[PDB]
Design an enzyme around this catalytic site. Structure first.
Site, PDB file in Angstrom:
ATOM      1  N   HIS A  65      65.886  40.628 -92.090  1.00 29.52           N
ATOM      2  CA  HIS A  65      67.285  40.293 -92.753  1.00 29.52           C
ATOM      3  C   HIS A  65      65.951  39.537 -93.919  1.00 29.52           C
ATOM      4  O   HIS A  65      66.057  39.506 -95.022  1.00 29.52           O
ATOM      5  CB  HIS A  65      68.272  39.698 -92.600  1.00 29.52           C
ATOM      6  CG  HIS A  65      69.538  39.149 -93.495  1.00 29.52           C
ATOM      7  ND1 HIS A  65      70.219  39.917 -94.009  1.00 29.52           N
ATOM      8  CD2 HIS A  65      69.321  37.962 -94.099  1.00 29.52           C
ATOM      9  CE1 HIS A  65      71.251  39.451 -94.986  1.00 29.52           C
ATOM     10  NE2 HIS A  65      70.548  37.743 -95.049  1.00 29.52           N
ATOM     11  N   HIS A 113      65.335  30.580 -95.566  1.00 30.63           N
ATOM     12  CA  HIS A 113      66.761  30.668 -95.742  1.00 30.63           C
ATOM     13  C   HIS A 113      67.283  30.089 -94.136  1.00 30.63           C
ATOM     14  O   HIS A 113      68.198  29.094 -93.816  1.00 30.63           O
ATOM     15  CB  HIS A 113      67.673  31.201 -96.269  1.00 30.63           C
ATOM     16  CG  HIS A 113      68.847  30.978 -96.602  1.00 30.63           C
ATOM     17  ND1 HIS A 113      68.670  30.329 -98.375  1.00 30.63           N
ATOM     18  CD2 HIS A 113      69.834  30.884 -96.459  1.00 30.63           C
ATOM     19  CE1 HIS A 113      70.512  30.720 -98.182  1.00 30.63           C
ATOM     20  NE2 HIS A 113      70.708  31.250 -97.723  1.00 30.63           N
ATOM     21  N   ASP A 114      67.074  30.407 -93.092  1.00 37.42           N
ATOM     22  CA  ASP A 114      67.933  30.768 -91.781  1.00 37.42           C
ATOM     23  C   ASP A 114      66.925  30.494 -90.453  1.00 37.42           C
ATOM     24  O   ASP A 114      67.329  30.541 -89.637  1.00 37.42           O
ATOM     25  CB  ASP A 114      67.763  32.369 -91.538  1.00 37.42           C
ATOM     26  CG  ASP A 114      69.278  32.928 -92.130  1.00 37.42           C
ATOM     27  OD1 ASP A 114      69.946  32.308 -92.737  1.00 37.42           O
ATOM     28  OD2 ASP A 114      69.038  34.433 -92.194  1.00 37.42           O
ATOM     29  N   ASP A 264      70.762  35.729-101.587  1.00 34.05           N
ATOM     30  CA  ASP A 264      71.350  35.957-100.046  1.00 34.05           C
ATOM     31  C   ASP A 264      71.823  36.497-100.751  1.00 34.05           C
ATOM     32  O   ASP A 264      72.472  37.158 -99.664  1.00 34.05           O
ATOM     33  CB  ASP A 264      71.357  34.346-100.029  1.00 34.05           C
ATOM     34  CG  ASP A 264      71.568  34.357 -98.059  1.00 34.05           C
ATOM     35  OD1 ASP A 264      72.115  35.462 -97.634  1.00 34.05           O
ATOM     36  OD2 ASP A 264      71.586  33.685 -98.216  1.00 34.05           O
ATOM     37  N   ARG A 418      66.198  13.340 -64.984  1.00 29.98           N
ATOM     38  CA  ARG A 418      65.904  14.928 -64.587  1.00 29.98           C
ATOM     39  C   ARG A 418      66.676  15.360 -66.442  1.00 29.98           C
ATOM     40  O   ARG A 418      66.261  16.436 -66.471  1.00 29.98           O
ATOM     41  CB  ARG A 418      66.360  15.446 -63.817  1.00 29.98           C
ATOM     42  CG  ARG A 418      65.568  15.059 -62.389  1.00 29.98           C
ATOM     43  CD  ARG A 418      66.014  15.348 -61.336  1.00 29.98           C
ATOM     44  NE  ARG A 418      66.042  14.413 -60.114  1.00 29.98           N
ATOM     45  CZ  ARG A 418      65.179  13.584 -59.477  1.00 29.98           C
ATOM     46  NH1 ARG A 418      65.958  13.035 -59.893  1.00 29.98           N
ATOM     47  NH2 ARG A 418      64.478  13.434 -58.416  1.00 29.98           N
TER      48      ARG A 418
END
EC number: 3.1.5.1
Lengths: 481, 83, 232, 83
Positions: A65, A113-114, A264, A418
């Site tokens: 995309h 963008h992502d 977009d 831990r």
């Protein structure tokens, strides 16, 4: 006055290239920036995050995309440059020797963008926000101190009789419940990965300008540019210098960002529709029937009639040739306002373009997003994120001395040690550097330390993939070995 | 789509109004004539009588929800002087 | 009162030697690091005799040579410590251990700190440790309803119920030996003293702890997933 | 390694001291000269002033934690007469 030499800044934050340079050196600088961006682990993480359908077939991921958004942005930038060159305004606007940087910056902004979304997308952000809202209750700090403060942290309660420290608690409590993808992307590019990008490249990914700690109403002259949070409180100073490097006023926006936003908005529709056919949900005939019922003549009729894997390759092209010139003309027409940074609208926001985009969007909402599988994945992701936060909760219940001792090396905190060692190296180093610079004598130290601890937790949670978070959630719950 | 924080703020304003012994009635639709979406809010009381009613139009829902929340906070400040 | 049987000392000594060396060997077999790294870490964390002979005579058969030297250096020391302080050990009041400032303590501490630095810090051990904690807590939570009953209800449940289906099934899930031990322990109690409920609760908790502690890792893990409806 | 019950008792003593409006500061290290491990405890108040500070040396940690817990209980008895 419009002069794009005052906006395309090739300086850096560290080891900046000073002095005079020619076109070739500038082009090499931006090619180097592309080299750092493309070969980053964030992109390979994008490789395995879902877009609409679960990861199996040839469905799309975030990366493919992003590869369409990049292409659309580059084509729009080229159209804008060509139209400006035709009218003999290219040399009067300072863009004569800056076309390559122009296109490269737009493409790289579209690619990043992502970069900062959490696993599961919209349902990951919701889960983080609700968890932290339950823990902090930011709505109880809007006014003078109360007796019914529901906050679960002793140091973040608004204890009447002190007004300088209260302002800080309000800011931190409001900021911690507004995780947003773009702010996390800015934080990731600057602090966590340390990529050392140019000022223009960093400004290209600043989409919205509202601070995360904002309370109240926004000015009527910025109500669109401030509809979403833009950056966090830990980057404020950084953002300040960014403005000084790009001649941006408060709550203003970098020009080229508009182009990226436009891209977009186109791909967002069409791609999803195609995947619906590939997963055997319905077919072409149903596509046309639903489109015609939910409704134009040119694109739809040409696509439906010239067709009687190759239908979509014909449908895209017509939509692009109908949409890109409109965006180019909208960019060029309102150029002074965009260059000032105060344009309170979007490029594609009553023409037929809005109608066509709304047609695609409503068909997708009616026939694709209502499928049971998407809905089930959305619920499962919400539950997984909530469970992971619940599991890592004990790290936030410690004290300043205990957490400080745990960072420097323990025998009194096995489970907590831990859990802390399970975190990544980069996030812990970021915490160490952030906390080291704080004055160790002010009464504001615990507030900042708690803020940075919560930031560390949110960075860890948001730095996973869908599959990794899911597997880790089942492992920590003793469901699988 | 709508951002989560805006919805959370709207819900918080609605809860604050409801705790004030008031009723909030929400209706929404789309107007194709103006090419936008419309949201109408009708405030009431324990008896069920209209007090204030307003409708907002916009093409983006993020701004629409912000306007609605701002109006709700404004009325809460107005009517929280007393009663 | 508060005294100890002589030969126990010897046993304790043994549990202190093997405790180090064996763990180290397994680290190599799981492909964590290698011999060269072993020597580098040992030399950095630090002796001449054992370490130098092991490292130089070596240039499955390295450890077979490393053990022997350590045994021939440690066992006579323990024997002499046992024989020297024999009257105190025979009395049962010796307030020290056999191997507790000689070079033996230094060598054992070397092995122990290398093991702590390079073996026990691996993510897998840490993950297994958290998973086991959660499994034991979950099993105790599952069997909690047996401890919320009353004296009469639990007594009636032991002798044979229609009023406690879930509790009866949970009780029948326990082993035969533990229930018989409970029966014999409770039978001998005087049934008239005001101290009966206290002892009965104590023995009920003892029964639960015996059942929980009488499992293996795999059995407890599988039973935990079965009782949580995660697997069929 | 350290037994769980000893750590639980030490934590209980620390919590009892802290509920008494006191502060407990813990530091630890190893002394290779004496071939042992050392633990220093520094008691304070809400203002941050030292009251009692002591350091213990031992080669086994189980005895060391028991000694520390005993000292903490002794001070709690001493300073819990009042204040």
């Amino acid at each position: 006055q419009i002069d794009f030499r005052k906006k395309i800044n090739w300086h850096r934050r560290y080891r900046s290239p000073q002095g005079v340079k020619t076109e070739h050196e500038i082009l090499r600088i931006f090619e180097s920036d592309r080299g750092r961006i493309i070969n980053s682990p964030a992109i390979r993480r994008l490789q395995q995050k879902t877009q609409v359908f679960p990861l199996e077939a040839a469905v799309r991921t975030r990366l493919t995309h992003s590869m369409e958004v990049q292409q659309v942005g580059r084509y729009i930038a080229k159209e804008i440059l060509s139209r400006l060159k035709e009218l003999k305004l290219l040399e009067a606007y300072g863009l004569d020797e800056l076309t390559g940087p122009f296109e490269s910056i737009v493409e790289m902004s579209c690619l990043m963008h992502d970069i900062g979304n959490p696993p599961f997308g919209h349902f990951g952000e919701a889960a983080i926000n609700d968890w932290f809202r339950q823990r902090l209750h930011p709505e109880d700090a809007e006014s003078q101190p109360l007796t019914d403060d529901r906050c679960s942290v002793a140091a973040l309660r608004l204890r009447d009789g002190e007004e300088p420290l209260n302002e800080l608690r309000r800011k931190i409590r409001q900021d911690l419940c507004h995780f947003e993808g773009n702010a996390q992307g800015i934080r990731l590019v600057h602090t966590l990965m340390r990529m050392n990008l140019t000022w223009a490249q960093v400004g290209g990914i600043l989409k919205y300008t509202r601070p995360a700690w904002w309370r109240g109403e926004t000015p009527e002259t910025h109500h669109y540019l401030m509809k979403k949070p833009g950056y966090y409180l830990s980057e404020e100073a950084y953002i300040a210098r960014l403005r000084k490097e790009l001649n941006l006023a408060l709550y203003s926006r970098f020009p080229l960002t508009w182009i990226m936003e436009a891209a977009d908005d186109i791909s967002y529709c069409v791609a999803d529709l195609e995947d619906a056919v590939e997963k055997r949900i319905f077919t072409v005939e149903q596509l046309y029937h639903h489109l015609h019922e939910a409704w134009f003549s040119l694109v739809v009729e040409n696509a439906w009639e010239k067709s009687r894997d190759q239908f979509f390759m014909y449908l895209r092209v017509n939509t692009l040739n109908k949409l890109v010139p409109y965006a180019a003309q909208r960019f060029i027409d309102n150029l002074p306002a965009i260059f000032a940074g105060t344009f309170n609208h979007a490029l594609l926001e009553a023409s037929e373009c809005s109608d066509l985009l709304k047609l695609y969007k409503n068909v997708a909402v009616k026939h694709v997003f209502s499928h049971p599988d998407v809905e089930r994945l959305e619920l499962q992701g919400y539950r997984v994120i909530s469970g992971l936060l619940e599991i890592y909760r004990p790290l936030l219940s410690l004290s300043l001395s205990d957490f400080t001792e745990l960072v420097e090396k323990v025998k009194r905190f096995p489970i907590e040690s831990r859990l802390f060692h399970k975190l990544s190296t980069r996030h812990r180093l970021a915490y160490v550097e952030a906390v080291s610079k704080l004055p160790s004598d002010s009464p504001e130290f615990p507030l900042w330390e708690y803020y940075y601890r919560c930031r560390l937790l949110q960075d860890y949670i948001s730095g996973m993939t869908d599959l990794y978070a899911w597997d880790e959630y089942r492992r920590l719950m003793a469901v699988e070995q | 789509r709508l951002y989560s924080g805006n919805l959370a703020a709207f819900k918080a304003a609605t809860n604050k109004l409801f705790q004030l012994d008031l009723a909030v009635i929400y209706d929404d639709w789309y107007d194709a004539y103006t090419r936008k979406d419309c949201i109408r809010l009708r405030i009431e009381d324990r008896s069920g009588n209209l007090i204030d009613t307003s409708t907002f139009y916009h093409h983006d829902e993020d701004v629409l929800f912000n306007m609605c929340t701002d109006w709700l906070n404004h009325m809460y400040d107005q009517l929280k002087d007393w009663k």
